[PDB]
Symmetry: C4
Subunit: 75 residues, 4 copies
């Protein structure tokens, strides 16, 4: 299945994922596509920051769902 990740300027990243993929896997795929390492990534769905160890289905993220990407800064 396909989902989308959007930056805050509305730039979009298209991903191929499975419901059993962890949020961490999704971050790895974002790194694969954009060079942004997982530790610098926060993903948000329905206003909620998503935890690395949980799956997409845990958050009811289904096909064509849109996630939001923001940076994690040091400190």
């Amino acid at each position: 299945m396909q989902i989308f990740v959007k930056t805050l300027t509305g730039k979009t990243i298209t991903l191929e994922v499975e419901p059993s993929d962890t949020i961490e896997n999704v971050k790895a795929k974002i790194q694969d596509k954009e060079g942004i390492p997982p530790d610098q990534q926060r993903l948000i769905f329905a206003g909620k920051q998503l935890e690395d160890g949980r799956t997409l289905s845990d958050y009811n993220i289904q096909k064509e769902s849109t996630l939001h990407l923001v940076l994690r800064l040091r400190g």
Copy 2:
């Protein structure tokens, strides 16, 4: 199976792959060999731009097939 990845100068990278390998896997292997991360890579077969989440067999890419590698620039 074995495939070749050619740069635009005709330089060749030899890879060992399975038809069920994703294009992303191939890019990982190119990184394993040349240090070029996946997000900087564009793979082309028969003039067709190749997507990370799909497999080699999805494109009918066969033994001794040649992919072409070009860089992805920012913006």
Copy 3:
């Protein structure tokens, strides 16, 4: 299950892991969260240095256990 990795100022990194995870996998997860590559990491449990090729269950590390993270320097 969830474990905690503690830095020496008592800063905490929380991880979701399986007992069958290798120490190396844990290091990969720490890299996923903090950007610290595995080779720079030493993990300690009950005063004992943990080996990359071994599992968490090999060390009898269970849920809510605390590991300590230390740096590996050159030479």
Copy 4:
């Protein structure tokens, strides 16, 4: 099983591996332990450079075998 990776000054890296592990997997473990990425690594066993896609058993690499590590430079 256990194998050894030796530099040309004879410093040793100890690895635990499977016969079904690829040469690339070993290079990944060498990166995990020393921070040297696979593309900069050449491994030598029995006077021959080892190809990433082969398994250890393809080269008849056995328990207590020692591989030799040399750098790959740009050309």
